[PDB]
Nucleic acid binder design. Structure first.
Ligand SMILES: Nc1nc2cc[nH]c2c(=O)[nH]1
Ligand SMILES: Nc1nc2cc[nH]c2c(=O)[nH]1
Ligand SMILES: [Zn+2]
Ligand SMILES: [Zn+2]
Ligand SMILES: [Zn+2]
Ligand SMILES: [Zn+2]
Lengths: 381, 390, 381, 390
RNA sequence: AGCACGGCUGUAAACCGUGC
RNA sequence: AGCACGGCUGUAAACCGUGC
């Protein structure tokens, strides 16, 4: 993998990652996002419906929470998860947790972190974690890590320290296990920057992780309620400073368009696309402008009666399947009558709109019109 | 004016192949018609249906009449525009709801009064209202509101409903304001009584409605009776007009009823069975929620052309069905509609090629292991129109 | 137990319940609330701190969620929970669920409902439930019931029906088990009205329950997000119509002052006092006027810097320990520095303010000045 | 002007009973002083402390200096007004923080530089600043900022800190602007070196500060050394002035050090042990989180008068400690402060009644099962001042 | 909830029974 | 998370180790 920067406007890194995914090359753009999935399918969408979307990201995020239960099955399939889930054309990043639900936390111990599934708590030792990675064969995978800091609010400085030390211990063990296996060689490991709200431990985490031969870094624990971020936003830029620039920066739990822009300012490259999913799930549609649990400002609520007779598309000019082929009035009916097509059509548009947003970020960055974009984004509905 | 053009006829049986010439394009028959009730195919986009090569699907007046309301759909360029369906739409009157919503149903000669437990607000469905709604929706084929009684019930009830239907039919024929664009169809509500059904057959055929449907047969009626009442109905229905059997979508049922002269069918079964995690195969069905299909890396049906069977394994679906992802349901809905269409298209071909009897034997060997293990009812039904199975 | 009504203004029932609690009489007023507790102690408060509060309710709510784990212990104590928890002077109502956390839902079956504890799911069959009640010996207890309707949103009309039928089956079984035991005779059983959003099943639930010799009724499943209520508010009045008036009406998950007033309008008598607790937990204080997860309008947030130097009491004229002895500036410090005294002082005032609110409701009802109260309540901060 | 009025003196030992005359009321000695650092007793209201009959408790300059800030507390009518404490307040300089925050501590002659990992913002603590903060707070007894080195460390470090303390003391005496209202106390930072401690004793006693404290002894130093350095210190300290030993609050430690001539003590141990689910008894402690106390229906201590032991059982507390209710912690905090006070008040009584040696034997029989199983260190310490245990 | 059975015929049905 | 051990001396401590 090689990251090349087209430009660096303000603190914002515009570029491409060229030799990605083992098989030849797959050019992936920064800054960018990752197709959010549940059990390896995009939520609500089959291949048909997925490929009906313009600007689907090259890489797709999947999570151990859903896949680990079926370690056995995947071990028997012997051909890796991409082919199993019928996404063979896609690059795959395996995260430890689903960002929409990071509530359970692993009950991390020195010898075990645990994801949460339908079955229940799945206790993964390092060996088991690396075993699962063998079965899955993703392009990228987050290394087993201790991210519980954010979950609790106590943040005992001794706890914060353990989060860093544990994460580094896991990283070093996993690196060795990768050395031994040929298959695993082909996978790229992602280091997890940690340290919570303690500046010192954040910098310590950043440097020590960077010392390892990881392919990229995950910025954990900045995931927070909307108000909290501005605070941790300073800590963010402190940390990215300590990371080498020739390696990509992932962040977890940040998908809100506003927060996204800001993290790009602080030199973050890759984002989860779970925000469009959450919007979909509450019967809402992304309407905010980019072209140049509370319902947010970026969206309208199609459950509302104002839309029962509104025969405009969701967003005028949106080339997605739904806006082009259907009206708000129609979606309103679908939601009201509790039909599964509501979700499919909402997911399709919400994804396409979000994917369009990123396209205009990169475009803005080329013309240093990003500040104007910030303002256009904060336009209401 | 005849809306169906006949093409071929298995000499041995009553099996017919033909075409329906409707305002929104030709429809090959025999035809299975997927049922999307509230202007939706329950999880699939109109494009996905368009791709499966479906040329006619249903909507339901009762549901659509209440929500979203006839006025709204009219402002929406009709049911066609609303759901963005290019092809033909057929609309049930709201008759069936009598059986399913028997609890909420009060019957007078004036119409059917429907209440919903959630909302006090009530609805009368007079033939006139049913027609009014259907005229607004603009469905190519509309259906008469009939007094539908369940097959299980016996009493003067059967007789009363049968005659009421006739009067309701005339009121519907009266109510129609759009014959040019929409084709009203009568429904033979005779119950399981030969005489009543027969009497209903006689009087109803006397009206000049474009097609005829066979109703009252969707229940758990004995199978021996089921097929006989079909046979009775078809034997007396105009050959130069469609025979639409309503509430039937099981494979063995569909094969046999084509052989008994039926031309059109609708059923919610394929779409529902899909939302319940069952996938239809030549050999019956696959309960994919079951743990057996965990390491099964083959498709649902190697011979299926539907998108699900091209790109997905039984194993992955089995894992996805246990997920919170609704995608699992859609993959099955897609395939199940495909199976039914592949079956109906397969059947029509065999009628045209004068090997419908051969087709049926091949079918029965798939479904039942042998024509040997075929259920007696189907054996009786087939033999009555001159098809034995070795 | 006998309920006598002083008056009935609009739909609002003002009165007293005289012969309460087996031992002699304990006059309890309607409309009124119940001391919210966690594991039999009021949250944060010891006896000292509790009795430091003016207008503590006569009855206190406890929950099986916390107590059931210790069935064994209480069985051995042989003297009932009031004495065990050092609240012997108090009347005790045992609810099945804690209102603050009703998320898990029981996984109800025909033969078993399950509360959720520290240990995990506790599977109570009817016999076990009634066994636990023997150990506890409360004044009142909610009968084992199926309230899952509200948890899910599907509300299959066949599910809604099962909720009613199951609840009635549990009621009849428990009634018999009470017949057999002398100790249990002394306890009063509360029937649970159910039926979700289906009007028909609601009325059915109301009538059939009323047919039983229950001492009172619990109005379940009206517990909802703030917007939802106005909708279910009609269904509420429908139901109370079907209940005899000489028996008190409890409701679960309704503690917001606004929602409280409205439920009183629809002839509800008794409320949980968990709202003041939730306010406490987010570092906020009740400030709304009555005298004549989002932070609500009824409260201020003492974490805010505007209060760092504000040397006024929480609410001027409030006779509670905190307002009388401490300032906002002080609480602000306590919260900022993460000290346990913040919680104690907040809980004390939040309780006292809430308890004062009820006093003014009853007072308003006597003078039919309730409508004016409604408006004074909706005053901001 | 002498702030302590002596009352009685066990002839055999150095045990003293007396009274401190402070601006906010008289304080009986020997006294244990609960430590609430950030203007709070960590879960209990000032009323609850008032009720336990506490007449003096501590605040800490470092924490309170940073948050909420000296200016704020001044506007708040001083530390007294802020926390609504009627009675006497003693304030640690911020010396101890050097040991506990050794990691964040940089030492120059000018002062102590303190950083917090969370916030870049730093603080210098010069004697002058420590005094300024203390003067604003208005604590009845304020403490000199001293160069505190841990007992475990050895080097010129011990010596350097010892002399620095002396210079810091003079700067503090200089810095005091409020002798009329507040009584500065010196702290003997000699380490475990006899000569250094001795030298520190000499020079510091030469200043006319109202009281003297013994510092540097709060560590895990060998017990044999602990008591000897106490004995050395008290043996050379003015008898007509208080002897305040800092960082000591364990029972056997407290009994013995009174016998070695100590008059005042502070420790966070009782309040912390409580927040950790341990409850202090004559026979050591009760780990109430442990499952043994599940069916124990007796109080913590039948002989305790504190509210916890009047109305609550061990069993209920054991169940409440496993709850999310913070109440469990408060019940223990209340009791633990009570135990320490009951102990100190019990000890003073026995000195007055000339049976302190008898009291000590009764105590040791409780704590250790017998004066027989007493730890040698306490045996040595007691025998050095003429108390044997049968 | 989750798991296992049994049920689905122009949809009170991403469901309904029965266990655990 | 929770459970079990071991730890707490003028409070980076409703905590910290170690398992599961
Ligand atoms: N209208 C109507 N619909 C159906 C669907 C199945 N059977 C019937 C019937 O008898 N009448
Ligand atoms: N200032 C100060 N405080 C303490 C508390 C324990 N030991 C000491 C000490 O040596 N100095
Ligand atoms: Zn769109
Ligand atoms: Zn298929
Ligand atoms: Zn107050
Ligand atoms: Zn006590």
């Amino acid at each position: 993998m090689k990251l090349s920067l087209t430009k660096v406007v303000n603190g914002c890194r515009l570029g491409k990652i060229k030799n990605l995914g083992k098989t030849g090359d797959h050019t992936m753009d920064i800054p960018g996002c990752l197709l959010y999935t549940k059990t390896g399918s995009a939520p609500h969408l089959t291949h048909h419906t997925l490929h009906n979307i313009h600007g689907v990201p090259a890489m797709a995020q999947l999570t151990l929470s859903s896949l680990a239960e079926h370690h056995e099955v995947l071990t028997e399939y012997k051909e890796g998860v991409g082919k199993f889930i019928g996404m063979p054309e896609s690059l795959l990043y395996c995260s430890l947790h689903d960002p929409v639900s990071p509530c359970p936390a692993g009950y991390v111990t020195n010898k075990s972190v645990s994801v949460w599934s339908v079955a229940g708590r799945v206790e993964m030792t390092v060996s088991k974690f690396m075993a699962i990675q063998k079965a899955l064969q993703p392009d990228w995978f987050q290394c087993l890590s201790d991210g519980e800091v954010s979950c609790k609010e106590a943040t005992s400085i001794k706890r914060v320290r353990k989060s860093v030390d544990r994460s580094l211990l896991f990283l070093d063990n996993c690196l060795r296990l990768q050395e031994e296996s040929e298959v695993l060689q082909k996978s790229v490991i992602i280091g997890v920057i940690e340290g919570g709200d303690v500046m010192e431990e954040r910098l310590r985490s950043a440097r020590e992780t960077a010392k390892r031969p990881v392919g990229g870094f995950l910025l954990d624990g900045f995931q927070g309620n909307p108000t909290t971020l501005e605070a941790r936003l300073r800590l963010l830029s402190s940390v990215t400073a300590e990371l080498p620039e020739d390696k990509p920066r992932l962040i977890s739990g940040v998908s809100r368009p506003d927060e996204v822009l800001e993290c790009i300012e602080r030199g973050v490259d890759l984002f989860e696309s779970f925000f469009p999913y959450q919007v979909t799930e509450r019967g809402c549609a992304l309407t905010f402008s980019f072209d140049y649990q509370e319902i947010t400002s970026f969206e309208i609520n199609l459950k509302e009666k104002k839309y029962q007779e509104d025969f405009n598309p969701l967003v005028r000019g949106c080339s997605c399947y739904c806006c082009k082929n259907h009206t708000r009035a129609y979606i309103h009916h679908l939601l009201v009558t509790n039909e599964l097509l509501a979700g499919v059509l909402l997911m399709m548009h919400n994804f396409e709109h979000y994917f369009g947003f990123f396209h205009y970020i990169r475009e803005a960055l080329k013309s240093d019109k990003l500040a104007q974009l910030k303002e256009l984004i904060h336009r209401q509905a | 004016p005849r809306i169906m053009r006949l093409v071929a006829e298995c000499s041995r049986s009553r099996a017919r192949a033909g075409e329906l010439w409707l305002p929104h394009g030709t429809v090959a028959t025999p035809v299975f018609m997927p049922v999307g009730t509230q202007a939706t195919m329950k999880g699939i986009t109109t494009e996905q249906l368009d791709a499966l090569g479906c040329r006619i699907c249903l909507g339901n007046t009762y549901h659509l009449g209440l929500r979203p309301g006839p006025e709204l759909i009219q402002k929406a360029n009709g049911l066609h525009g609303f759901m963005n369906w290019p092809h033909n739409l057929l609309t049930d009157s709201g008759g069936f709801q009598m059986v399913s919503l028997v609890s909420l149903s009060e019957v007078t000669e004036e119409g059917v009064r429907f209440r919903s437990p959630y909302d006090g607000n009530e609805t009368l469905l007079s033939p006139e209202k049913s027609v009014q709604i259907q005229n607004a929706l603009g469905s190519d084929i509309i259906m008469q509101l009939d007094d539908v009684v369940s097959s299980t019930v016996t009493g003067p009830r059967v007789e009363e409903a049968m005659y009421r239907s006739i009067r309701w039919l005339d009121r519907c024929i009266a109510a129609h304001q759009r014959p040019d664009k929409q084709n009203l169809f009568a429904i033979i509500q005779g119950g399981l009584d030969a005489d009543l059904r027969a009497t209903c057959l006689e009087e109803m055929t006397k009206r000049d409605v474009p097609g005829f449907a066979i109703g009252g047969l969707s229940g758990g009626e004995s199978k021996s009776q089921f097929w006989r009442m079909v046979a009775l109905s078809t034997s007396r229905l105009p050959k130069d007009k469609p025979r639409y059997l309503m509430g039937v979508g099981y494979a063995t049922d569909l094969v046999v009823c084509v052989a008994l002269g039926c031309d059109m069918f609708d059923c919610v079964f394929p779409t529902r069975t899909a939302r319940f995690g069952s996938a239809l195969v030549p050999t019956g069905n696959l309960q994919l929620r079951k743990k057996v299909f965990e390491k099964d890396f083959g498709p649902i049906d190697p011979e299926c052309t539907c998108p699900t069977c091209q790109k997905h394994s039984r194993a992955f679906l089995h894992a996805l069905l246990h997920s919170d992802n609704t995608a699992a349901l859609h993959h099955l809905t897609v395939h199940n509609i495909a199976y039914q269409l592949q079956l109906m298209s397969a059947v029509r071909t065999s009628i045209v090629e004068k090997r419908f009897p051969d087709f049926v034997r091949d079918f029965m060997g798939a479904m039942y292991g042998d024509p040997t293990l075929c259920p007696t009812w189907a054996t009786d039904a087939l033999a009555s129109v001159g098809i034995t199975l070795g």
